[PDB]
Amino acid sequence: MTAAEHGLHAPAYAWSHNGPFETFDHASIRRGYQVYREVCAACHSLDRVAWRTLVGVSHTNEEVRNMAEEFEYDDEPDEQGNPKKRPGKLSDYIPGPYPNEQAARAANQGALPPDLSLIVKARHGGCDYIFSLLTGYPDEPPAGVALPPGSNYNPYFPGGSIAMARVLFDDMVEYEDGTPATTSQMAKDVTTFLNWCAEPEHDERKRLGLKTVIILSSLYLLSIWVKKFKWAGIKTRKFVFNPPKPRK
């Protein structure tokens, strides 16, 4: 394939959760849900993330019981069988912005926007690509490239032509803790947040690994010793041969 039809290689950024002993930045997920809600909750579902997983990770218990009571879900019907709605609770999933697939295609010129639950594990590059996609839009595409009407250019998408327009502009959100909301500051924060949504165990998967590599490599140096202990009678055996009397 040509390099254009392959996408540009997303580079190696210095994420705060790379390395084997590091965890997520839980002040960059709380600032990364706010950029999800105020920017890409318009056209991206998050249909695998329950509301209860945000409790204790980046929001308190009352901040999620006042974020799920903004939306409305289908209650069980009443005593006459009419359908009815209820405000949400902690056991429900984050509701997508479109009711079905055809409503999603109709609003974005045919292109179905993918659900962002596992979008960092399902792309070649991980969060180094999801970050560099959002900041990779040139002001004008290179010469000779004929874009179809209604497709934006950025090189990091495989093919060159993407359907999402350039969406992150400077100071479009106002963070709670007083952080300078630039384009790179916002694109780092969702890309940490979408990394959390696809890997909610990443804090505890890396500290169960610290228990296991410490035990199962001090169980391997010990088992080298007990092998060398029990085989010391065989590795230092001595054979002498004096040939017998040939008269027999």
Partner: protein, 54 residues
């Protein structure tokens, strides 16, 4: 020394020291590896982010 007679002689008290030595190794090594893992990541955990919300 006389360490052999009390501990390693009877196998009923040798393996009773393995299990009583693994009951202390569970509680201590887990707390020692949790209190290092959060101290290496001081400032990123939710227990610290909840303190910035003043």
């Amino acid at each position: 020394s006389s360490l052999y007679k009390t501990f390693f002689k009877r196998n009923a008290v040798f393996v009773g020291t393995i299990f009583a030595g693994a009951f202390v190794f569970q509680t201590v090594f887990d707390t020692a590896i949790t209190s290092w893992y959060e101290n290496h990541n001081k400032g990123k955990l939710w227990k610290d982010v909840k303190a910035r919300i003043a």
